[PDB]
Amino acid sequence: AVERTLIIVKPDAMEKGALGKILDRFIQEGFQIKALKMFRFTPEKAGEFYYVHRERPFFQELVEFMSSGPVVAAVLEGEDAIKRVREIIGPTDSEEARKVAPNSIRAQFGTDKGKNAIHASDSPESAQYEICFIFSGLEIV
Amino acid sequence: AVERTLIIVKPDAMEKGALGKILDRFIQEGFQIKALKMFRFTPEKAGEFYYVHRERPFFQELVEFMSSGPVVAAVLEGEDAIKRVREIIGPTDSEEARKVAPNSIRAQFGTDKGKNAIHASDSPESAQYEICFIFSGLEIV
Amino acid sequence: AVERTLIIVKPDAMEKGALGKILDRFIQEGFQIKALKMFRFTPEKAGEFYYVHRERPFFQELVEFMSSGPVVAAVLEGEDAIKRVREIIGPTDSEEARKVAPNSIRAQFGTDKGKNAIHASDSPESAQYEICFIFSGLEIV
Amino acid sequence: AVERTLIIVKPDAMEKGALGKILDRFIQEGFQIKALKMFRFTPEKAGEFYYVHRERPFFQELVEFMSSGPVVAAVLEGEDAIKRVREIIGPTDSEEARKVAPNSIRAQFGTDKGKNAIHASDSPESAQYEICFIFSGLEIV
């Protein structure tokens, strides 16, 4: 099915100068960018975005990191997008990504498990929530 | 239950100068305004907002009217908000509203069935869709 | 000359429930609302908005107050708007406003000099800066 | 001097799939992206953006083209940005760009004089206007 998923380019990848290369990859893989913007999470908004993981040990570190500098979000649309985008980004741990998926976003631009370049929706339920969290319908063009 | 609903002040009420009086009413009724903005629907975006009614005879007239001038949307939060807000706005037909609910928004500021001052979400399912259509999570404060 | 000015309803007036009454007043005085939204200043953005006053003794208190809860900004357009809006809001000190301008916004909804309900651009130069700080051209409708 | 300029990636370059490659170039040239978003000009907003050129013979064609599909704007910051960005994009006519500046944005991704991939502010005065037209201060991060 044609699906929409949310990616967020994280501050580590922003700082490395990888934004354009990352967007280029998803464009060349055939996804339509339906929304795109640079913004800065406040710590409160980062915590709301990541609500489902609020009880995890790493949560405060994640919130701080994702509000530590500007990020860029995009809505990607295409066939099987949620799973296909997860394949393109690679394993959570950027070092594992380098071993098993060398051309994945995280292999190319990630550092480790925390600074791993990019977020993507992990499921249709999270995609629905995450897209609405960042973009209104008025912003989808 | 505490709920969120979407209202939109329509161009007829905007033109009458009723915006402030309408917002004042919902504030005094005890609703929290969680998001608020003036914007202009393009005809395409109005048609998407009203997707569920696309097959109704009045649809093109509605789309045109709701894209004919700027509107103001607000997210209202409170106990039983969806139904309570519908009570405050009154019957669809502003003339009927004057007969049965004289202090309702539509009695006070509506003209007829089409120019009836204000839209409100009609159900929890529509509220979910409508709020996301107009406001991202980043805009709810 | 027809001018545009920026008002911001401050958190004290928001909390008092005065938003609708304040907007109603400017509408009835004949101003066109060209842009309107609820948002929350981060402390950094409040400090940038108030850049010209950064060296004043009250600056940190002002920044904190204006980022302490959501605010609503509006662009008002009309003949001589910058000065006329300043007249409508009244003296900086809400207590003085009650003595000399009883129907002014600050007399009606202000508390003292700091919690004084509303900000308005003080000059054409500040209006130009302030309007752009809060609203893009795309948001003026 | 450190300056800010506005670029807009036009619908021809969007359709060619060049967005990421174009952003990558400006990042690698050392510009800071201070704001970024995808949006769609209405014809009215395109005409306002291009107000200074409203009397030119090509104006309606330009307005139509720039409102014919989504575009992406970015604010670029760096030393001598306005002139340096103009150098990077190359001559107005993409065919001339291919002859004299083969690695310029317009040589790489432009088609002709009208479909020439990208807009950039032509002066500090236009940059000031254009940046405010598309982005508020709240959107610069």
Give an account of the 3D structure.
The structure is a homotetramer of 141-residue chains. The first copy, chain A, has helices spanning 11-16, 19-28, 43-49, 59-66, 81-89, 94-100, 105-109, 124-134, and strands at 2-9, 32-39, 71-79, 118-120. Chain A has 141 residues and is an alpha+beta fold. Chain A has one domain (1-141): Alpha-Beta Plaits, CATH 3.30.70. Chains in contact: A-B, A-D, B-C, C-D. The interface between A and D is medium-sized, with 22 and 22 residues.
How would you summarize what this structure contains?
Chain A has helices at residues 11-16, 19-28, 43-49, 59-66, 81-89, 94-100, 105-109, 124-134, and strands spanning 2-9, 32-39, 71-79, 118-120. With 141 residues, the first copy, chain A, is α+β, with helices and mostly antiparallel strands. Chain A is globular.
